[PDB]
From Swiss-Prot, chains B, I:
Isoform 2 is specifically expressed in brain, cerebellum and testis. Induction: By homocysteine (HC), may mediate accelerated synthesis of free thiol-containing proteins in response to HC-induced oxidative stress. Also induced following exposure to ionizing radiation. The modification N-acetylalanine is found at A4. The modification N6-acetyllysine is found at K19. This is Elongation factor 1-delta. It comes from Homo sapiens (Human).
UniProtKB/Swiss-Prot annotation, chains E, H:
The modification N-acetylalanine is found at A3. Keywords: Acetylation, Elongation factor, Isopeptide bond, Protein biosynthesis, Ubl conjugation. One of its GO terms (molecular function) is cadherin binding. This is Elongation factor 1-gamma. EF-1 is composed of four subunits: alpha, beta, delta, and gamma. GO terms for cellular component: cytoplasm; cytosol; extracellular exosome; membrane; nucleus. The keyword Acetylation applies. Coiled coil: none annotated. It comes from Homo sapiens. Probably plays a role in anchoring the complex to other cellular components.
Length: 207, 32, 215, 216, 215, 215, 207, 215, 32, 216
């Protein structure tokens, strides 16, 4: 059977999105409860005091958005062979190490989460172009990142790119990456994705 | 990461200078 | 697994490479190391076209299997050359392994690097780099200490990728800055760390490890 | 006469130290901006406003109170210096250029190759590292012979020659030149210690601890 | 009073050209020794006599008629110059130092990387050449903007600034800067062509043919 | 030369690779070894497309320089990582080096291989493979013996690629079949061979070499 | 100065051809004298008792066709850089190890030097096809094997292929290797080559 | 008297199909145990009880009702056959051994190499697959010539020869032998289609769909 | 050389058989 | 009954030995052609005439005096055998197929992997070699347990089982199975020695010397 339990998080959290989308595919039953992340009981279950955090109905506890998404996934989203599973870890790790930092820097001043810094965002723009370009060459001949089907790899990389595409990747900026754009559009228009993300509108005019 | 990348981009150390100086020396020594 | 065989591209004494090298000691996988340097072009570090063909992010460590399977990111490489036991034999164990691996990357690597090598952070205006990193590391060791109070290893009852990954992420700290008066507060974490690095599979890759003396 | 202005840099920049030590001798008034909001390394020096005045995009960068801009570290140290530091005569001035040039072309690359890994900035193979160690022995030996019957490099007084060469050797002496490695060069060691304990050097460098054991 | 002396170098050395061109302006009497029996590069400069005067044993090397010895091409050029070439004010002098240091730090390495294979000094690497081309594009563009409303780099007259930058750019313009490549830099090309056609430059460089088709 | 650096593709303990490895001990060149196996497909030995791209003959040893320069054939590799002294400092010495290298390949390799490993030749109807090869080797050692009567090394007065190549070609014979009663007749050749393999540059690659005992 | 001396050999020897062609390029003066390769004086100078053998006018002695060709060459035929020189050794070594054995086997029964063996020559044909094919891909974008000019590499490989092209590489057989054919034709039509080889006629009908 | 017994195997095992098809012809009563609780592959076959009877611990494994145990799929198929399937004369018997051994030595390895990636058993290597395709072309062509004027491989009736070769070819025909590929082998395709449509084959194999488009 | 090449072409040993048998075993064991 | 014919092979072919030893027991008249002009390995077996009769292009290849052709080594050994060597009963015949099949699929590949490098035929890495050594220990141990209370593999008499397994182990025992390696398998060693000293084996194999020290 698949997992069933409670996911502690604030909504509008892209890290939580990864697990929720994954559960749409797997049929895991995941109840979302807001966050308390400093009370002894919470720290008892989730020592690091981070959200998202997952408690199974059988009492199993896990934290880190990657581990939670892994847990409520099925074998196909995880990678049904050791090669495919290693490629999943590969893209997940690349999203964390290479995409999250410049993505934050750029999209944060447009969502009010960080203050504007013109040159900081110009620097971030460049690093984002390199990442979009890398994905573009890779996806030139591929439907998805790993094998022939959506995996955690796509889910993870899409969610990490989600706010960029909504807020700042305006037409002229993204036009150099038609393959990345198509792959992104193909993912977010899946029922499983729309179920969590709703109807995503690609950026119109660089915010 | 970004910091090391910036620092190195700024300094532009010619780490390979000894290779070039050595090839050049050899080149002009041999014209005898 | 035991059958994986391939070439690991990396410079020597790289803790990121150590993760896969140690995993392969457990699994039986045959991992050979090739240490070809990048090129330095006027402030820019570049790798060969053949390398970028297989590994487009241009990072090391990178792994090419003898059957041509390519994978990069130290975590994915270590995953690949591991067996089922190191990966986690059940979805529960496997998820716990992803948890500590992710925790290592997000929470331990940045202050560990900063405390051992503060120069770059200071140059980029992190004035109190050292004291800030030292406090984060203190918090991390304390977290591991409470967790390991009643456990031999992070997941289940034997070494997994969890232990391998967290140990490798802590390796420079324990060698260079975790003084006896500082580490004294974490006897649990110290015991687990010693129990790991003294196993022959860790020793084969790490050699003899000298813990930081009083500075 | 003397220079008055503002100097942009990241902190702990040996290239900036050259000018700041020179200013201690000359009396130049140099205001250092090395932290946000005034300077952010990797950001400020890439902005159009910065590039307008300092096209190379490098720091240290100097803007005089009168608007005079200078964008390379040897030039900034020259500008904030006085006539004695620059070289009083053409002979002395020539020798200053010689040693400044020697530091830039001969010392900086092997020094960087050896020291940057010990600081966590990058990695070099044991070939490049070994070639670097050998080049540095050659440099320290050249200096050692030169300083056998000299207090300082040029004209028996501190000039830009000493300031520049000392600043380019500073990380080496702190990080990797352990007693067993540096033993063979007593005149160089003596001259280095001599310079960095000058009141004008100490004012900028603070207390310097020589490598007790090679960083690896 | 202008320098008089001997310059040891192998022939056609751009580093030596800097001093020789400076001497055209200043009137210094610099005689070149560059061929056997007088100077045999690789032998003469490794003798104890030579090494006595020039400890690094490199060329160019200058020995004045009064015994005064200088090494490093920048110092030799400075010494055989006059005050105008060195920079008449502290402002001009500082700007000359600026461009001399820029030439060494920023121009020489990509210039060497690109040009040496075309001369048979180094094996050709395509990626290194490509990166050097783009670095040279950046440099020519920096100069182009700077020379937009300037005749020369410093104080509206030839100084060591122009002489040094021109000599470090000389092999590029001969070997690899074809019309279509350098077309983007009309101010730099204009300034370069102007300098090499000054009587004092031509006295040393002779007639220089700009790259027709890239080598 | 000293500056050459690159990756040598080969399986370990390959006498053909030993030629370049020993040469690099003399020259200072940095040669790292990568031992990735070929593929065996239904009786056919094949190598990867990337390998065949650089080395179309599909043979090892093969060498790729860190600057991308590719070369195959063990003699060419050893030539490349050598210096001028090992190659031959004069056309006379250089020609003598090509002579012994060529003699090694044409006249020594076939009977050496056959005597140490006669199985394949016997299978392909060379009934008296062993006795035939033994007589050819006897002739070869006798030729070297007369030549070395008055000489320390094959060419000039120091080790060249001549000695390195002939020693490597004789290495298995001296280990496996050249019994004391057989080799007794060639004290000159034996002395030269011992003088070579005991030098630190040979020792670094060959380790301690035990000569064939009585069988 | 270049070499001058006597070359001991029978004429019609392709191994000798390498040195003689090389001398055409270099301006070395090489007098050809027939062979005696078992007398004490010969063995005194040339211990291995092989021809070709070269004695310089100054008494310098060298054997092996590769070494002789090397000696009467100039720096350009030898390789004017260490990379080019290593490539020369490379092609020379490949000619000796890979081309000479199957070339002999096939062309020998058609020149009366060895007896016919149908399957032996069919096997040799195949190995020759692999070598011609390897050269064909290499020479697709190159005029000569090394650098931009004839070197010992071309001279050596041409001479090793010389008898095949004369005797057995008939049109239908060689048509698959247009680049190798053009390179071969380009070499043998050089003045230096024709001076030694005369007018080479490519095979008409597989002998 | 025909064999009666139990066959241990995982399900859909072509190696087991050989015995089961033979049993259709001979009338042997062979019952399959292939699912838990009775047979759990990877567990049941590693128990001391199983290993007592079948020391290699592999499947298929046959235990007769009289206690007689056989391993190796060829031996099991032989045992549950009748004399006609085994070959009625020494000539026919020898020809059956011939084709059974040919299937194992020549067909199984390229068949496995090509098919296993399409089933997710092995990672796909393009060069291995390409070489396996060409080896399968050679094999189909050998069979095609042999079956030109033969209905079956041996003695004009179904024997273990046909049963074994067909079972070793079965995954190829299902997974990768598309019409355009197999078109060159009309006699082999005819013989294969004929065999799998014999009542005894269909009883075991069911309806077999030939590869539409190559996997 | 030619002899080893012929011998190996003739024998066609499946040197990689253990890799295939091991992958196959694992594949069918996991369907539980 | 019994077979009479000609056998083509390269000399010292263990696959040919199977049939020749079988013929010693049965009385089959087998003429061996293993040298030019009659057989040239790599040539004769590639000719159209050969391929006509022996489509696989392999040796040993057998043509009976009556024109009957057989082109695979197990089949040739079967054909030149008698009823006892083949297996008298279906039970025994089955066991013969078992061991013949076991030798082909389990013994030949690791044996080849380990032994071919020691013979100068090819190279294998120390992984493949180590896996091979381990597989061979497994095989010798399986045989050792099996032969604990058996003289021969099937029915207490030499069959094709012994002949085939002995021939597939022959190079291993000569080349690499040194006393310290083979010590753990006394029943296998005893059975091997027993078989190869049978008059019928010795007639084909001659004297066999067991490895004294592992070839490397």
């Amino acid at each position: 059977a698949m997992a069933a339990g409670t996911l502690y998080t604030y909504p509008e959290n892209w890290r939580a999105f990864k697990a929720l989308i994954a559960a749409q595919y797997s049929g895991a039953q995941v109840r979302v409860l807001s966050a308390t992340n400093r009370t002894p009981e919470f720290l008892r279950k989730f020592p690091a005091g981070k959200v998202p955090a997952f408690e199974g109905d059988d009492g199993f506890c896990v934290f880190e958005s990657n581990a939670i998404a892994y847990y409520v996934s099925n074998e196909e989203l995880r990678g049904s062979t050791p090669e495919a599973a290693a490629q999943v870890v590969q893209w997940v790790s690349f999203a964390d190490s290479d995409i999250v930092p410049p993505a934050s820097t750029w999209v944060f001043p447009t969502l009010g989460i960080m203050h504007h810094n013109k040159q900081a965002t110009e620097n971030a723009k460049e690093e984002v172009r390199r990442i979009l370009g890398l994905l573009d060459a890779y996806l030139k001949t591929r439907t998805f990142l790993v094998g022939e089907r959506v995996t955690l790899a796509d889910i993870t990389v899409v969610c990490t790119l989600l706010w960029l595409y909504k807020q700042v990747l305006e037409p002229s900026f993204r036009q150099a990456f038609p393959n990345t754009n198509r792959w992104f559009l193909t993912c977010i228009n899946q029922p499983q994705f729309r179920a969590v993300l709703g109807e995503v509108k690609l950026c119109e005019k660089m915010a | 990461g970004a910091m090391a990348t910036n620092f190195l981009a700024h300094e532009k150390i010619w780490f390979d200078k000894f290779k070039y100086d050595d090839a050049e020396r050899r080149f002009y020594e041999q014209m005898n």
